[PDB]
Amino acid sequence: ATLNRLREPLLRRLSELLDQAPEGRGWRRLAELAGSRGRLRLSCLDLEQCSLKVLEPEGSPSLCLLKLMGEKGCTVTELSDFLQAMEHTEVLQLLSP
Amino acid sequence: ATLNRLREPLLRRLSELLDQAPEGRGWRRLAELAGSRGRLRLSCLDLEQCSLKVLEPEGSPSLCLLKLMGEKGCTVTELSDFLQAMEHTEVLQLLSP
């Protein structure tokens, strides 16, 4: 099933963890990677709408992003693939001149 | 000279006109084109900072964008090249299936 259809506690938890992740592997980098590596396409405007969530008392840009990716077809295993690609590309970029 | 060093009345006027342009040839499309066609690179975060300008009483996202492009080296003639490329690509996309 797609991320936006995940049980709502689990999706909450995913979004909290991604919200706490460092800049190099945060929701913006996740959007960057999913918007270039798959047929899933995000514009700057979508990212903006998610970014504004932080203005709500306990708002989550990662919750917005994950739901949007799910609506665009992303599944849990696809998200996991994306996150480990994030890890690999981060360390490869650190080691690159 | 660069856009951010233009006389400040002229830069005002450029930004007002771009702010009034339609969606197909607006400041977001200008950023899109300049961020892919030249070595000038804008992130979604820069565009976000410009987008937030509209929250100021008479604020201008195009003013922010044009200054940022100038700081990154864009000249007046380069901006004109970008704007006419905007026109051409818009009409080519309308005529494309």
**Residues in chain A closer than 8 A to B45 (CB atoms):** 28
Using N-to-C axis directions, what is the helix angle for B61-71 and B27-37, rounded to 10°? 20
- Tokens (6 digits) for A72: 């665009």
Q: Provide the 3-class DSSP secondary structure of residue A46.
A: helix
Alpha-carbon span B71 to B73, nearest angstrom: 5
Identify residues of A whose CB sits under 8 angstroms from chain B CBs: 28, 44-45, 47-48, 51
Beta-bridge partners for A24: none
Which one-letter DSSP state was computed for residue A56? S
Each as own residue / partner, the long-range contacts of residues A78-82 (CB below 8 Å, 24 or more positions apart, any chain) are A78/A38, A79/A3, A79/A14, A82/A30, A82/A33, A82/A34, A82/A37
Q: Is the torsion defined by CA of A48, A49, A54, A56 positive or negative?
A: positive
Beta-bridge partners for B2: B75
Alpha-carbon span B73 to A10, nearest angstrom: 47
Q: Provide the 3-class DSSP secondary structure of residue B22.
A: coil
Alpha-carbon span B50 to B52, nearest angstrom: 5
Alpha-carbon span A14 to B43, nearest angstrom: 25
Cβ distance A32 to A81 under 8 Å?
no
Check CB contact under 8 Å for B28 and A51.
Answer: no
Terminal CA-CA length for chain B = 40
Residue identified by tokens 């099933």 is A1
**CATH number assigned to the domain comprising residue B80:** 1.10.533.10
What's the total number of domains in chain B?
1
Alpha-carbon span B94 to B72, nearest angstrom: 31
Cβ distance A11 to A60 under 8 Å?
no
Main-chain dihedrals φ then ψ at residue B44, nearest 5 degrees: -60, -30
- Tokens (6 digits) for A6: 């995940």
- Tokens (6 digits) for A50: 């998610």
Helices first, then strands: H and E counts in chain A = 5, 0
CA B39 to chain centre: 15
Check CB contact under 8 Å for A48 and B44.
Answer: yes
CA B12 to chain centre: 13
- Tokens (6 digits) for A21: 């992740």
> What is the chain B residue with the closest CA to A32?
B44
Mutate to test the interface with B, among A41, A44, A65 (most CBs of B within 10 A): A44
Check CB contact under 8 Å for A28 and B47.
Answer: no
Helix spans in B1-97 (H): 8-20, 27-37, 44-51, 61-71, 76-94
Identify residues of B whose CB sits under 8 angstroms from chain A CBs: 28, 44-45, 47-48, 51
Enclosing domain of residue B48:
3-94
Q: Provide the 3-class DSSP secondary structure of residue B18.
A: helix
Alpha-carbon span A49 to A63, nearest angstrom: 11
Longest dimension (CA), chain B: 43
Nearest-neighbour CA in chain B from A57: distance (Å): 19
